[PDB]
Amino acid sequence: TSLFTTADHYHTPLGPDGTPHAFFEALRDEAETTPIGWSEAYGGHWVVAGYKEIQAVIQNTKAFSNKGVTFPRYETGEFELMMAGQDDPVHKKYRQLVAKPFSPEATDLFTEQLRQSTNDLIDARIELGEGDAATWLANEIPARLTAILLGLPPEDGDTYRRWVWAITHVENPEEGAEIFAELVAHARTLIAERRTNPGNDIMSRVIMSKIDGESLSEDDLIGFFTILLLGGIDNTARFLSSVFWRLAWDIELRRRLIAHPELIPNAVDELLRFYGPAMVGRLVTQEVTVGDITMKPGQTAMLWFPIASRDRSAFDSPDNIVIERTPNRHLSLGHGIHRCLGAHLIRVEARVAITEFLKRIPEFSLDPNKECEWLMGQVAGMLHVPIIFPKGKRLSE
Ligand code: HEM
Ligand SMILES: CC1(C)O[C@]2(C)CC[C@H]1CC2
Numbered sequence: 001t002s003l004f005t006t007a008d009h010y011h012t013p014l015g016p017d018g019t020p021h022a023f024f025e026a027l028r029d030e031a032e033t034t035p036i037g038w039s040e041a042y043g044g045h046w047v048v049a050g051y052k053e054i055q056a057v058i059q060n061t062k063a064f065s066n067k068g069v070t071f072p073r074y075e076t077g078e079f080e081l082m083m084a085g086q087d088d089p090v091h092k093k094y095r096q097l098v099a100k101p102f103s104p105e106a107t108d109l110f111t112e113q114l115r116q117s118t119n120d121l122i123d124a125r126i127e128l129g130e131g132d133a134a135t136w137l138a139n140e141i142p143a144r145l146t147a148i149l150l151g152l153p154p155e156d157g158d159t160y161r162r163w164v165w166a167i168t169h170v171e172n173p174e175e176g177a178e179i180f181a182e183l184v185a186h187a188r189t190l191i192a193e194r195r196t197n198p199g200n201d202i203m204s205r206v207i208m209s210k211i212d213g214e215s216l217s218e219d220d221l222i223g224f225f226t227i228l229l230l231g232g233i234d235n236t237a238r239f240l241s242s243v244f245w246r247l248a249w250d251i252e253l254r255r256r257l258i259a260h261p262e263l264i265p266n267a268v269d270e271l272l273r274f275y276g277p278a279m280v281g282r283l284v285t286q287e288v289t290v291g292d293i294t295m296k297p298g299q300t301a302m303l304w305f306p307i308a309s310r311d312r313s314a315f316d317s318p319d320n321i322v323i324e325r326t327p328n329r330h331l332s333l334g335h336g337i338h339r340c341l342g343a344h345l346i347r348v349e350a351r352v353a354i355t356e357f358l359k360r361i362p363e364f365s366l367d368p369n370k371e372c373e374w375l376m377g378q379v380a381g382m383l384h385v386p387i388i389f390p391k392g393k394r395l396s397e
Helices: 021-031 051-059 090-095 104-126 133-138 140-150 154-168 173-196 202-207 218-249 251-259 261-275 343-360
Strands: 036-039 045-048 130-132 280-284 288-290 293-295 300-303 373-375 381-384 386-388
Touching: 045 051, 051 288, 051 300, 104 133, 104 140, 104 343, 130 133, 133 140, 133 218, 133 343, 133 381, 140 154, 140 202, 140 218, 140 343, 154 173, 154 218, 173 202, 173 218, 202 218, 218 251, 218 261, 218 343, 218 381, 251 261, 251 343, 261 343
Parallel strands: 045 300
Antiparallel strands: 036 045, 130 386, 280 300, 288 293, 373 381
């Protein structure tokens, strides 16, 4: 038997712990013999699980195109995910427009805003002794940050989450497209207002930019708005949710982060390796042989980063969360020309979120009376993390 034959990132077998990690470990074991397998899912496609094979594919821009970045394709109507859904030269020219706001030096400037926000969110339920770590904290920290990045109202996370859900998981096609059309309508209004009353946000920045002499089309701007909205509300929320879940039951990892705050950055990278949400696809545009397999134009290859991040040939003791691991060349944020634009930002965000969470609530656990829930898909992570903790006090009010 072979686990590749029915491999499907939206339908990953879950173990008793509630995650797909037992399955990931088993597939990792099989990938030592067969690093790339054909899955019958989605009409048939390639599943690339070995670390060196993923590197070979992701570095080859000649035979692989990012037009297949989301598979099944995300619901974004007639729009494309800017940067992520493009190949060079188009990709490079668009990314250069937002490189500055995402530089490590620029992203460092969000630290205090994120520290205060995390604390403000925690105040909301600290006196209650219970709450869903995902919905209450993990979803909100990035939702608020992203809204600020886009010049949107921070208090409308449910609206943004509804759009994101439509793009990534709504099952009914029409309902999905109609809800994404809502995002487009809101974006149009935002763009027109920024057009005349600009601010210091990134949308404002791209609206005033120019490529080869001319301003970007409204459609291009909607693509920028969409991909940045997805990075925060989807990717970051699912990652942090899985992290909070882990910290709720792993009392060993938790006490060490509290005792060694200086290890938190390295710990964040190790958690990124272990709980990376993502996976990405690539559209084959040229017959190419990777490893022992030959791919043909028109086929799609899914890069299963979570399996590659557990490759024994790339990481010693891959199944353990070694907080002091360094270097840590995980693929959770991609590699090459499409490597995560938000890499430094999410490292800062995770450091702050974890630090403040453990500072305010050093003692907590999973709620024995409530169920945790894992969200499967191209971005996979905990969706519901009910926890309980001894009642505490608010910092403000
Ligand atoms: C923990 C959070 C996140 C994870 C795990 C994640 C992961 C990834 C990965 C795997 C890629 C590579 C795409 C490919 O190879 O095709 C990527 C690309 C990208 N990400 Fe992130 N991401 C996260 C958060 C964010 C955030 C917060 C933003 C920005 C606000 C963002 C913006 C982007 C953009 C624009 C690209 C495309 C870059 C390009 O094509 O050059 N991501 N991300
Ligand atoms: C899943 C992943 C990695 O995240 C986003 C934000 C960029 C590329 C793809 C699709 C959307």
